[PDB]
Amino acid sequence: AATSRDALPNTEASGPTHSKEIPALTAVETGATNPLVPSDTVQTRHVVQHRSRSESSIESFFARGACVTIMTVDNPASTTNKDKLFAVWKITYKDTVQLRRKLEFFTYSRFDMELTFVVTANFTETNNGHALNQVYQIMYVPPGAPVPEKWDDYTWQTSSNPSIFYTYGTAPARISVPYVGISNAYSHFYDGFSKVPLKDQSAALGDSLYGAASLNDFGILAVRVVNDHNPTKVTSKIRVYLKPKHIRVWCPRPPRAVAYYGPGVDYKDGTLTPLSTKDLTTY
Amino acid sequence: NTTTMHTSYQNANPGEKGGTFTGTFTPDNNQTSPARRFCPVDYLLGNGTLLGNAFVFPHQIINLRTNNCATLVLPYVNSLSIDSMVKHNNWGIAILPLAPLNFASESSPEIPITLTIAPMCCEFNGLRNITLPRLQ
Amino acid sequence: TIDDSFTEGGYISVFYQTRIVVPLSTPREMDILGFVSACNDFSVRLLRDTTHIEQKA
């Protein structure tokens, strides 16, 4: 019955003592942290506490969106040699770092994801030609569905794939997706593999990546400029922001201390130096 | 430092003998036939996180003065009710000397460490033919 | 819905227990038909477009 925004217990008055009750002395080897308050070691006063842990609840700690990726698409001229650029991006929280580490304070989590889509666009060729406001379609291609090969193939028809139609110059695009995990919670660390290499099988036939599984395959996001070829090329970037609302977490882990190196837990040489210099006898 | 999540199944699972941590990271530069193993640095608790916070995990400390043993009871923990134990490890056992081992005034003392483990509430499904994994 | 290791389903296999036995003046070789369906507790989720259909240009 203790809510997140409720006041923490008041610190009460305590005078002098001298007996056989031992608050100060314990043993950490047992694995238990001594749950002491100030009155156990010092003489304190009656104090009506007012502060609350309202701002540190799991909900509140993650109550923010974070740039997860930056996608790049364009609309060049018809006379072009290289094909119009369409972006494909696999849905992961692990391309960026900030959000990842927060998520990584825990081993498992349940949340409904809210995604926002900020879109930028610019001219690239130093000309004086013109472009007409663009519309961008962000289709969600789940694992299994056909992933576009052309900016103009049959996939972009979207009969069952969720797709967003964003007009440039308006409110950034935002959708919601429920807990879509194949497991009962999203796993942030997997201590295993996908395949089991068997004795009577070729090593090649039995290999898989360490810590890699379907637990994390959510398909890709495909985007293009709906507009047809324009005489003067226009570049555009869609910045995606993920907010894990309605969140639940399990098993606390120490936070990443060394800069990340790939989607795994691996680290590289010369990055393994997080702490600076500080002498033992100085403040 | 060339490829990530590159440790093979064999090296990942040493079984009963287990493995060890190291005090110095050594990147394998044999690009012809890589070692494909772990190189778990001690102070980063082999995972890229300071050993100091390791206490966030259920733990105990075998401090010679006080105790000779550490007993921990671990329930089944995963993202799902049951999983393939052959493919996936749910719990890890890390033992690192927080304080160094010294005796009297000798130069190379030694004291054995032994682990006895017991499953609890052991259950299995999907019975089929024998799995013969390649362990080497 | 994809071919995947982590979400692998297993193996289905048919074998002769005894053997097929027929009398004389009886076709020595025959065929078998197989059918598959879901049970009252089968469900699917996450709607996506199929790849067994397509339009070229």
Epitope: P146, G219, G262, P263 | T3, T4 | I2, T51
Partner: nanobody, 128 residues
Framework: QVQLQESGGGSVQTGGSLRLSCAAS????????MGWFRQAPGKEREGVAG????????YYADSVKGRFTISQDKAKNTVYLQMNSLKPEDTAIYYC?????????????????????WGQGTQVTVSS
Amino acid sequence: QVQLQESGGGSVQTGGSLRLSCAASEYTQSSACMGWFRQAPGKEREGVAGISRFFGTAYYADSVKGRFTISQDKAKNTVYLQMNSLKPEDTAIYYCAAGQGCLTTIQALGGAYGYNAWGQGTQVTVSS
């Protein structure tokens, strides 16, 4: 699966050009870097070439760089492999290799580990 169907078994002499192709028409989580593996009956199976599905992440085995190149048709869907200046040391059975979720060929970059759909096999002999 995807479709993987390969051909191109021409026993050329030492120093000739050969082209290998593998179908990848159906679009599953499509062959990322793809993959080309040769099995020398003296040795075993080994990875060789590979260009990312969309990106220009093409890895080349130490033994084949420059001479062997990977490229495909982002439409006609088939994967080409230009193998020129052929040594007699490259006489092996080649195979194409679908590495699905692109990250499979981004993490490890090279194939081998994230590869689920296996090709048929074409015998290439480069002799005197």
